[PDB]
């Protein structure tokens, strides 16, 4: 009874039952390092200006 | 001008500038340990952006 598969049937991407649980950490990462600290909040302009020696702005 | 005008003047004066020096030693402390760290804005040298990267199934398994 065995039916010959047509042209592209065995390049088919298939699905799959398993029991087999879903890998957790598959690469065995550490634990990634912490990002650094954001920069949140309204911009200000800066205090007395550039500050570069005697400039006032 | 009279003494007051100029007395009160000169308080203005040194307010901004006791500000500003003030504030010129803080930014070099800050420099340093941004510097020396490297946890802040600063002194942030770029590392390889991580969505360059391809998640697909690869042709081959262990990778
Ligand atoms: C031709 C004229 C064209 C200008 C007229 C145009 C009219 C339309 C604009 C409307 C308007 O009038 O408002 C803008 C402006 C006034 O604006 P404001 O809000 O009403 O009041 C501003 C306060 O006066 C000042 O408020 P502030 O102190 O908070 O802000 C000024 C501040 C930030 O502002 C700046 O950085 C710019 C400074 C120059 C602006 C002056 C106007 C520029 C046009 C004239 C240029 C002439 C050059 C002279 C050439 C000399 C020969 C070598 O100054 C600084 O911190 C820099 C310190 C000086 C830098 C020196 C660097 C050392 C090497 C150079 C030495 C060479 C000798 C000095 C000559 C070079 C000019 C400094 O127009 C002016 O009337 C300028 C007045 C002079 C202010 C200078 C500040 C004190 C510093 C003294 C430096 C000695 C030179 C002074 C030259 C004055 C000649 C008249």
Same mark, same amino acid.
């Given at each position: ?57 | ?10 308080? *203005? ?12 030693? =803080? +930014? @070099? ?6 510097? *020396? ?12 952006? =991580? +969505? @360059? ?11």
């Amino acid at each position: 009874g065995w039916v010959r598969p047509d042209l592209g049937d065995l390049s088919k991407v298939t699905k799959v039952k398993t029991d087999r649980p879903l890998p957790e950490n598959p690469y065995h990462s550490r634990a990634r390092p912490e990002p650094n600290p954001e920069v949140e909040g309204d911009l200000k302009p800066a205090r007395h200006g550039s500050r570069l020696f005697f400039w006032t702005m | 001008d009279g003494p007051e005008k100029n007395y009160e003047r000169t308080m *203005a004066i040194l307010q901004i500038e006791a500000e500003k020096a003030e504030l010129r030693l =803080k +930014e @070099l402390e800050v420099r340093r340990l941004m510097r *020396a760290r490297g946890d802040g804005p600063w002194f942030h040298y770029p590392t390889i952006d =991580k +969505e @360059l990267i391809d998640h697909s199934p690869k042709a081959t398994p262990d990778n």
